[PDB]
Amino acid sequence: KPKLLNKFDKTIKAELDAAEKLRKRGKIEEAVNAFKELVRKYPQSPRARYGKAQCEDDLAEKRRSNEVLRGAIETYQEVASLPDVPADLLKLSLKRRSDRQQFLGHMRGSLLTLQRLVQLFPNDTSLKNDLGVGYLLIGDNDNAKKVYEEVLSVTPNDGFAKVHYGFILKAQNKIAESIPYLKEGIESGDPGTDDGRFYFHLGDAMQRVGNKEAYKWYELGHKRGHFASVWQRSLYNVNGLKAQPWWTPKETGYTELVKSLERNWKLIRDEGLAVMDKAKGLFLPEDENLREKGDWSQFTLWQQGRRNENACKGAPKTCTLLEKFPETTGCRRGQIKYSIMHPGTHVWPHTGPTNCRLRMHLGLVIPKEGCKIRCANETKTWEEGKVLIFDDSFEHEVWQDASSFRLIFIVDVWHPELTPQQRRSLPAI
């Protein structure tokens, strides 16, 4: 189907096929040399150049080398620079260039490639969509939103554009607006629409508006393998980890950590209160659109397994106490933070991103009534000097209807069934 050979390349199709044949047989090593020989002999051959690139691409896979993949990325560029490049080959080469640029985290570089691809093929809808993903990956939702608006003005039925537009709308707290786009988008069945993200956020948007159809979409996302279960909807998981909403200290195995938190809870409280009184700016409002209403702020000591040096100068004793417990300080998919919530606060039902952590809550200042947390089908209360443990990858919900502030200390730990090597290798969240 795809025509990759220009006039001259057709005259050397035998040599080109011979070299490509070696690459398919996994003998990538002598295929590199075969294509490099063709590139020397025919320095303007787009197909020979593409072969060199693909081989460099496979060699990067084998050797796991960023440097050679960087080379492949340049060779894919080289293909586009040669004269008389067939349209199919030009598109393929630059698409792969972008893909690999994103893999390396050269998201800015990827963007320029995607912009070029759209400039070269102004009627290709899929490339406009890919450009939209490029903007999303760098955090540029404004430019992403424009791209999908542009796509949808020409192609209103494009499901990919709809789910992504819906995703952006929901991120912007345009809940009601987002639902039909997410729904129609997933329902389109277009490639790239069957993604856990869109099931996750469609049901959540529906929950927030009181649409009881929400769990029907959670059930479907589960059925399609996006969620471990209807209750546990995290999307960055290690499959198989013991899954339950509430944990006892003994069940976690982190009994020494719990002992330390509970024995020393007042020093932790006191440093938190001191920061509230003398440096309240260190508490940052919750910024993930999880509140229906009210005031909720957090003062973070560790995130992604990295100590915040300045923050720990505000709670030096607490940070010193925690240094002894790598199960939390080294939890690169969790945090250590104070969490203050005031009356008139309701946190929407929500889910954390990963099943690889468990979340400890130490009560520091807990009004006698008004404060509670639901995880799955069970609601519990905090106690001063006492640790609660739950898996926040399960849907949970929080209320604060007391007559004064509620302060807790949040300590995330690796899921105990995670091996030392998994703890070492899992990318940070």
Binding site: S65, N66, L69, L136, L137, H201, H350, P353, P427
Partner: peptide, 18 residues
């Protein structure tokens, strides 16, 4: 932009290279 308590971001991880 990080995923701390939720899944608000398009991607929650950020990898660079092999």
């Amino acid at each position: 932009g990080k995923c701390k308590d939720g899944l608000g971001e398009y991607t929650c991880t950020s990898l660079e290279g092999f």
